Write a protein that binds this ligand. Sequence first.
Ligand SMILES: CC(C)CCC[C@@H](C)[C@H]1CC[C@H]2[C@@H]3CC=C4C[C@@H](OC(=O)CCC(=O)O)CC[C@]4(C)[C@H]3CC[C@]12C
Ligand SMILES: Nc1ncnc2c1ncn2[C@@H]1O[C@H](COP(=O)(O)OP(=O)(O)OP(=O)(O)O)[C@@H](O)[C@H]1O
Ligand SMILES: Nc1ncnc2c1ncn2[C@@H]1O[C@H](COP(=O)(O)OP(=O)(O)O)[C@@H](O)[C@H]1O
Ligand SMILES: CC1(C)Oc2ccc(C#N)cc2[C@@H](N2CCCC2=O)[C@@H]1O
Ligand SMILES: [Mg+2]
Ligand SMILES: [Mg+2]
Length: 1145
Amino acid sequence: KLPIAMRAVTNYVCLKEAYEEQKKKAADHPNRTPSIWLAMYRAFGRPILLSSTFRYLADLLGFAGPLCISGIVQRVNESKEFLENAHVLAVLLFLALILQRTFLQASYYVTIETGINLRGALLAMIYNKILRLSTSNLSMGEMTLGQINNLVAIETNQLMWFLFLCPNLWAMPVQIIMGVILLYNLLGSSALVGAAVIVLLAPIQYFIATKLAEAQKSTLDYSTERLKKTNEILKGIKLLKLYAWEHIFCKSVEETRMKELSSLKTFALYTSLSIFMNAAIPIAAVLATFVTHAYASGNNLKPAEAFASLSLFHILVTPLFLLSTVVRFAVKAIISVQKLNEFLLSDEIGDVAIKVTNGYFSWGSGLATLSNIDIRIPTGQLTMIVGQVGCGKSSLLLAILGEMQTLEGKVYWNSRYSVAYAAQKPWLLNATVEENITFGSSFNRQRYKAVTDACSLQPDIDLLPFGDQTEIGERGINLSGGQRQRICVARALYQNTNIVFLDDPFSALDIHLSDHLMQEGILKFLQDDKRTVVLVTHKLQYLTHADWIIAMKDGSVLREGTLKDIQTKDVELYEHWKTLMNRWKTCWWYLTSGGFFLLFLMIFSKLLKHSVIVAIDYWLATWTSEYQTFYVAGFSILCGAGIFLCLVTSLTVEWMGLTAAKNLHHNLLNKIILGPIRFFDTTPLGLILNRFSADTNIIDQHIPPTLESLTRSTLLCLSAIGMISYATPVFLIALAPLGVAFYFIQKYFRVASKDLQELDDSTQLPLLCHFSETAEGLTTIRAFRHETRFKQRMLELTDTNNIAYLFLSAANRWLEVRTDYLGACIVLTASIASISGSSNSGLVGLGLLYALTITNYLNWVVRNLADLEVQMGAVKKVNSFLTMESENYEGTMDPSQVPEHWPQEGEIKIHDLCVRYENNLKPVLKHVKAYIKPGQKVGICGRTGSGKSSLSLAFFRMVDIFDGKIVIDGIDISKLPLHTLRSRLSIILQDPILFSGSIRFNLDPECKCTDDRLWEALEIAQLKNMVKSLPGGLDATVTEGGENFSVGQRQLFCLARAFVRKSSILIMDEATASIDMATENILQKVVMTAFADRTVVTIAHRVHTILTADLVIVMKRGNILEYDTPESLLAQEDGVFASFVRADM
Ligand SMILES: CC(C)CCC[C@@H](C)[C@H]1CC[C@H]2[C@@H]3CC=C4C[C@@H](OC(=O)CCC(=O)O)CC[C@]4(C)[C@H]3CC[C@]12C
Ligand SMILES: Nc1ncnc2c1ncn2[C@@H]1O[C@H](COP(=O)(O)OP(=O)(O)OP(=O)(O)O)[C@@H](O)[C@H]1O
Ligand SMILES: Nc1ncnc2c1ncn2[C@@H]1O[C@H](COP(=O)(O)OP(=O)(O)O)[C@@H](O)[C@H]1O
Ligand SMILES: CC1(C)Oc2ccc(C#N)cc2[C@@H](N2CCCC2=O)[C@@H]1O
Ligand SMILES: [Mg+2]
Ligand SMILES: [Mg+2]
């Protein structure tokens, strides 16, 4: 499989020991952080020393070119002592070249091996950190799941790619210095003038690296923010599309994209300037050197010395080809490792089954949310926790589990035992249903059947494509909320632990499913195993079954004991409870996106640049062919034109890249956000967010540099071929076999590369997904204490990905070795042809040194072409989304007919409405006919899967209608533009989607509302006091996903978000699912007293709420059964509504 040295386990252990030694060294000092760079050096240095040794030997052998060219030229110009023989020197040059290529490839192999080992070790380190970091980092905005995913995907790979190129940073300097030292021998003091111009690259490149570092840090910041906004959009597309807020968030994302593109333009300008200097300081150095020699040494250059010096200049230029690449990658890797080091230095976690005494706990801030927690959980009994929204129940659970730092008090666990946690926000991995329910336990069909029948999952799973073996979660078929929650509770029940913490498992479930889970699942199945159970529920009707009762108010336990104990001590609380219960082509498109003028300007400028650059060498050959003002003047004008064209060609390609990136991302976003909701339901969010993050990163930052390096290399190779063939017209014949050979090796490479490439992208996706599903749901993994198994799985997956990437790199090295030997053969053939069949004593030299150039740059041509193919793949992925269906916003009703206040009355008539989600699917709604008067209170009830939500989303045309007319105030909604319909009606969904920013930003993203109405709304939604007490008032922050607030408070914010709009029709779809009964009653009273004029349709979670409603509808499999007042339906014998009321009460 993977050799032991290359396993992620050993590399991780080595890097971890190095980093722990660094942490010791840091503990030695105050304000001296541990450094990843020294840890990595100490751990993985010896391989890098080996590769550096190979590189130095390669450079020393590369200096054989100058000597051999000098000898060959001198001999063409004019035993065993025949080593001067031209052919002998040519053969020695060929052998030196093959040996240099062997050493270079050995160095590359060692470096890539080390880079892959280090990538594995770093991913292991940050994965263990994920398993260690406290959730208060994500809850308070310290960081986000997206940032951690960015670490795993972009930043670690950026460090790895830099480490591939690392030996250059110290090898390129040396190779340059040696060159100067040799030039000085041939040319005397004149060569010191060129040495100064070359030395100036060090200050210049350091300055440019400073500027690039600043620009890259800014780009990374704005990329983080833009991806945050994009992810929040994609996750909440339903709410945005329902509120007509799509374009507002699109505009904000575009603003952040503009800032990111300004930072990218600074980075491109300074990258384009570094390329200009690396190219034009050699032109200037050649000028200075040879002009000075012309006017200092009276003796002219003999051809041998001239060509030796020119070859030394070529050997200097080769280092500077890759200097821009290495400075770019080093500047990116420095930022990357700053981010990694910030991540790895963060906050980390610190009878009677559980006994908490005098416990003050806080959510990683400094102010206590729980105080005076004196509780005990009796062993093997049912403990129920009851409290209004935001009273510390989930806080209490995650405190016992130790997930929030303790300020005072103790918890005793008569080290922690494995506790089965069913979190309030259910978490599902990307495995099958069976894997999520078993969750790392031996399959037992008897227990599995018992659990599945206690959670009523059987009818729901047999409706799935592959019953019980269908992939679930992100990247798989998306289950409804109730299905996901019941799968999570099934997971909790199936495990063989003794303590089961269930945090409100009945939020999404209806009355029948909830009662079934309570009777068969908790009271019967768990009490048979005699397992401790802690329930956090608002279902007060279940308090009769409770064995122990904890009551929580305002963060502190108000009273604790059996029901009778509470009745005897706190008569008030018991009476309150009783009252409440009432008892390719893509490449051409990328090039053309410039506009047919940037492309042709680029290509013509590059060709002219190389024409002049090669004319410089031809001119030097002709000039030194003597053994003057005219030659100096011609040389100067050629060099100046070369510098100018270098500047132009540098700018053009980067500008092309900028424009292409901007247009690609803009089209992608403005087409994704206009798609139908069916597209987002069907397509996994991963397949879209990856386009937005990884493919966008490639398009922005990876394609322009690869393309420019490819063009430079290919034109250097073509220039060398042209010069050689001109010097020796016979070489063209020799170009027939070799060229053909090229075409073959590449061919073979492809049929493997492609294959391996697919593998390397199919084995990386699991790994990344793991880092996701552990970053999310971390508290669950640490509640079951399955951290060891997840570490093992991460090591396995990273080993697999490393095997795949190692084979990919091995194929690349195969092709590179083959092309290097082909280039050595090209050099040999050109050398022989020039020695034997060239006219002048100067053309032999040009042919030889340009053959050397061919060998030097053909390798880069091949490598960069392969990389550019793999990246045009990503451009193809991004372009694929411009063929989406676009929701029809146009509308047909003339805007003149639509009044200025269209829902002015709020009377809805639904005539023969039949709704389906996709064509050739079951009609969820069947010939429903409804008539709600203006200013009428309508309550719709039914069992899960009865089309309540379909009937709700019908008004906003998020479900495709087969037949039926929905007339709101005399207008068929089918004619209106989508926005005038979706903006003038307000709907409160069941899932509390919440965006990052202030409270204001979540209540009115347009900022078109005064603070007074925001306070009115937050008063109706019962959140006025909590916001008044919050640090920043209405400007208080809301971290991504609303994690810093309770679930109930998230829902109440979602209710205020609807109350602000103040439209005439309010569709409340199970809005009080997570709200407790105490808050829910007062909230309903206030909403009825405030919206008494408007028309509200309430799809109710409990029938008690819709008892005081003007009209009641009961749905059953898409059919309205009873249509009358609640009194009539109650008085009907054996009626459905009457049965609902008994169960709910
Ligand atoms: C000119 C000849 C003799 C050698 C060609 C390369 C070298 C000049 C070396 C010596 C100094 C090196 C540069 C000096 C330091 C930096 C900055 C470094 O990034 C940072 O320093 C962080 C940014 C910051 O300081 O805020 C990235 C590598 C780089 C460009 C180095 C790249 C390789 C350089 C140019
Ligand atoms: N992840 C979190 N990070 C920081 N503060 C939090 C977090 N969750 C809740 N809080 C704060 O803790 C207080 C208690 O909320 P908690 O999380 O215990 O809700 P809960 O009572 O379990 O929820 P509900 O009963 O509505 O389902 C709230 O004021 C909230 O501000
Ligand atoms: N996103 C969806 N795409 C296709 N069909 C769905 C989707 N959601 C629900 N359904 C189907 O429509 C029917 C009614 O679902 P729904 O309207 O969600 O019921 P409820 O009113 O209880 O929410 C169900 O039988 C279900 O199979
Ligand atoms: C004028 C010369 C000495 O200086 C430069 C400057 C920039 C670049 C580039 N890229 C290349 C070169 C030399 N060439 C031209 C073809 C191969 C090579 O090394 C030039 O012969
Ligand atoms: Mg809760
Ligand atoms: Mg529903």
